Amino acid sequence: MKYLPQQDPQVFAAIEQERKRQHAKIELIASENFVSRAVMEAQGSVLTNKYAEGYPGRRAYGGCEYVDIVEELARERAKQLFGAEHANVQPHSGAQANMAVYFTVLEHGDTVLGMNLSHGGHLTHGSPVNFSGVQYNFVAYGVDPETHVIDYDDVREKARLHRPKLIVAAASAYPRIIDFAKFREIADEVGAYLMVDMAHIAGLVAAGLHPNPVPYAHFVTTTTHKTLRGPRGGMILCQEQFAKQIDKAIFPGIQGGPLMHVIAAKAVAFGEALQDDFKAYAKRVVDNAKRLASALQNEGFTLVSGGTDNHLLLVDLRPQQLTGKTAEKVLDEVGITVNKNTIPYDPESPFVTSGIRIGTAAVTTRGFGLEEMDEIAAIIGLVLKNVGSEQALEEARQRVAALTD
Amino acid sequence: MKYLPQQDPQVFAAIEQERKRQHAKIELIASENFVSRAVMEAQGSVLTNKYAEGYPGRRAYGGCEYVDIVEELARERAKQLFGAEHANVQPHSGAQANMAVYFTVLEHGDTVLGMNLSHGGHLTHGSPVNFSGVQYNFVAYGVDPETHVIDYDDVREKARLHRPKLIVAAASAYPRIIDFAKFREIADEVGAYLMVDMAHIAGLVAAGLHPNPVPYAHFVTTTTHKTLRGPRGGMILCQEQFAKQIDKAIFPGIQGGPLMHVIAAKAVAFGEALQDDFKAYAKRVVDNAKRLASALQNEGFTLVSGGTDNHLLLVDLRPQQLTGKTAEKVLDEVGITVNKNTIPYDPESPFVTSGIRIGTAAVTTRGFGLEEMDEIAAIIGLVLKNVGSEQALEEARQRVAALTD
DSSP B154-183: HHHHHHHHH--SEEEE--SS--S---HHHH
Give the C-alpha separation, B60 to B187, whole Å. 37
Give the C-alpha separation, B389 to B398, whole Å. 15
Q: What is the resolution of this structure in A?
A: 1.8
Active site residues of B: 51, 53, 197, 223, 226, 232
* Nearest C-alpha neighbor of B346 from the set B148, B138, B112, B164: B148
Residue A150 DSSP symbol: B
Count contacts between A and B (CB, < 8 Å).
267
B48: left (phi over 0), alpha (psi -120 to 50) or beta: alpha
Give the C-alpha separation, B373 to B369, whole Å. 6
Active-site annotation holder among A58, A226, A277, A405: A226
A354 is in an annotated binding site: no
Residue B253 DSSP symbol: I
Burial zone of B211 (CB within 10 Å; 0-12 exposed, 13-18 middle, 19+ buried) = middle
Helices and strands of chain B, counted as H and E runs: 16, 15
Question: Does residue B124 sit at the A interface (CB-CB below 8 Å)?
Answer: yes
Give the C-alpha separation, A287 to B320, whole Å. 70
Dihedral (Cα; A315, A320, A323, A326), 10-degree rounding:
-100
What is chain B's Cα-based Rg? 21
Contacts of A202 (CB under 8 A, 6+ apart): A222, A223, A224, A227, A228
Domains of chain B as residue ranges with CATH: 1-32+284-405 (3.90.1150.10), 33-283 (3.40.640.10)
Give the C-alpha separation, A235 to A224, whole Å. 7
DSSP letter string, A310-355: SSEEEEE-GGGT--HHHHHHHHHHHTEE-EE---TT-SS-TTT-SE
Q: Between helices A370-384 and A390-404, what is the axis angle to 10°? A: 160
C-beta of residue B1 within 8 angstroms of C-beta of residue A60:
no
Out of A17, A232, A256, name the one closest to residue B124 (CB): A256
* Nearest C-alpha neighbor of A273 from the set A80, A40, A37: A80
C-beta of residue B253 within 8 angstroms of C-beta of residue B103:
yes
| H-helix segments, A25-114 | 37-43, 65-82, 94-105
C-beta of residue B4 within 8 angstroms of C-beta of residue A268:
yes
Cis peptide before A252, with omega less than 30 degrees from 0? Answer: yes
Give the C-alpha separation, A260 to B85, whole Å. 32
Give the C-alpha separation, B167 to B146, whole Å. 24
Does B14 sit within 8 Å of A95, measured CB to CB? no
At residue B220, what is the residue type?
A: V
Closest A-chain CA to B332? A62
Q: Which long-range contacts (CB under 8 A, 24 or more apart) does A322-328 make?
A: A322/A384, A322/A387, A323/A348, A323/A352, A323/A353, A323/A354, A324/A348, A324/A352, A324/A353, A324/A354, A324/A355, A324/A356, A325/A351, A325/A352, A325/A353, A326/A387, A327/A356, A327/A384, A328/A356, A328/B62
- Residue B137, Cβ neighbours under 10 Å: how many? 16
Question: Cα A395 to chain center, whole Å?
Answer: 32
The answer for A 47-66 residues in CB contact with B (under 8 A) is: 47-51, 60-63, 65-66
Out of B17, B63, B66, name the one closest to residue A14 (CB): B66
* Nearest C-alpha neighbor of A31 from the set A120, A132, A150: A120
Question: Cα A146 to chain center, whole Å?
Answer: 25
* Nearest C-alpha neighbor of A32 from the set B259, B67, B49: B49
Contacts of A185 (CB under 8 A, 6+ apart): none
Dihedral (Cα; B230, A234, A250, A124), 10-degree rounding:
-110
DSSP letter string, B37-99: HHHHHHHTSGGGG----EETTEESSS--HHHHHHHHHHHHHHHHHH--SEEE---SSHHHHHH
Does A253 sit within 8 Å of B66, measured CB to CB? no
| Three-class SS state of A359 | strand
- Residue B248, Cβ neighbours under 10 Å: how many? 16
Burial zone of A95 (CB within 10 Å; 0-12 exposed, 13-18 middle, 19+ buried) = buried
- Integer distance in angstroms from the first to the last C-alpha of chain B? 24
Active-site annotation holder among A104, A124, A223, A365: A223
- In angstroms, what CA-CA distances link B325 with A164, B148, B331, B354? 45, 21, 10, 8
Question: Does residue B222 sit at the A interface (CB-CB below 8 Å)?
Answer: no
C-beta of residue B193 within 8 angstroms of C-beta of residue B221:
no
At residue A372, what is the residue type?
A: E
Give the C-alpha separation, A154 to A159, whole Å. 8
- In angstroms, what CA-CA distances link B61 with A29, A128, A318? 9, 21, 21
C-beta of residue A225 within 8 angstroms of C-beta of residue A33:
yes
C-beta of residue B244 within 8 angstroms of C-beta of residue B208:
no
* Nearest C-alpha neighbor of A360 from the set A342, A337, A340: A337
Technique used: X-ray
* Nearest C-alpha neighbor of B161 from the set B181, B141, B179: B141
Question: Does residue B268 sit at the A interface (CB-CB below 8 Å)?
Answer: yes
B302: left (phi over 0), alpha (psi -120 to 50) or beta: beta
At residue A362, what is the residue type?
A: A
Contacts of A55 (CB under 8 A, 6+ apart): A71, A247, A251
- In angstroms, what CA-CA distances link A98 with A130, A133, B43, B232? 12, 13, 25, 21
| Three-class SS state of A397 | helix
Which is it for the CA torsion A324, A330, A332, A336, positive or negative?
Answer: negative
Extended beta strands in A61-215, E state: 86-88, 111-115, 137-141, 166-169, 193-197
C-beta of residue B269 within 8 angstroms of C-beta of residue B203:
no
Contacts of B301 (CB under 8 A, 6+ apart): B315, B316, B319, B320, B380, B381, B384
> Distance (Å) from the C-alpha of residue A137 to the closest C-alpha of chain B?
14
Give the C-alpha separation, B37 to B170, whole Å. 30
DSSP letter string, B295-350: HHHHTT-EEGGGS-SSSEEEEE-GGGT--HHHHHHHHHHHTEE-EE---TT-SS-T
Helices and strands of chain A, counted as H and E runs: 16, 15
Per the DSSP assignment, residues forming a β-bridge with A150 are A143
Give the C-alpha separation, B13 to B7, whole Å. 12
Q: For residue A365, indicate whether it is catalytic.
A: no
Give the C-alpha separation, A198 to A98, whole Å. 11
Burial zone of B152 (CB within 10 Å; 0-12 exposed, 13-18 middle, 19+ buried) = middle
Active-site annotation holder among A27, A68, A71, A197: A197
What is chain A's Cα-based Rg? 21
Mutate to test the interface with A, among B1, B2, B10, B15 (most CBs of A within 10 A): B15
- In angstroms, what CA-CA distances link A230 with A78, A236, B27? 12, 15, 31
C-beta of residue B221 within 8 angstroms of C-beta of residue B196:
yes
Mutate to test the interface with B, among A1, A18, A224 (most CBs of B within 10 A): A18
Q: For residue A184, indicate whether it is catalytic.
A: no
Give the C-alpha separation, B289 to B30, whole Å. 10
Give the C-alpha separation, B258 to A356, whole Å. 23
- Integer distance in angstroms from the first to the last C-alpha of chain A? 24
Question: Does residue A337 sit at the B interface (CB-CB below 8 Å)?
Answer: yes
Beta strand A26-27 with A336-337 is: parallel
Contacts of A304 (CB under 8 A, 6+ apart): A148, A175, A313, A314, A315, A316, A343, A344, A355
Quick one: which H or E segment has residue B137? strand B137-141
C-beta of residue A44 within 8 angstroms of C-beta of residue A231:
no
Does A339 sit within 8 Å of B18, measured CB to CB? no
- In angstroms, what CA-CA distances link B62 with A27, A56, A328, B57, B257? 10, 40, 8, 10, 14
Angle, vertex CA B236, rays to CA B51 and CA B309, nearest 5:
135
Per the DSSP assignment, residues forming a β-bridge with B336 are B26
Q: Between helices B94-105 and B240-248, what is the axis angle to 10°? A: 110
Give binding residues of B for pyridoxal 5'-phosphate as ranges: 51, 93-95, 122, 172, 200, 225, 257
* Nearest C-alpha neighbor of A4 from the set B359, B151, B14, B44: B44
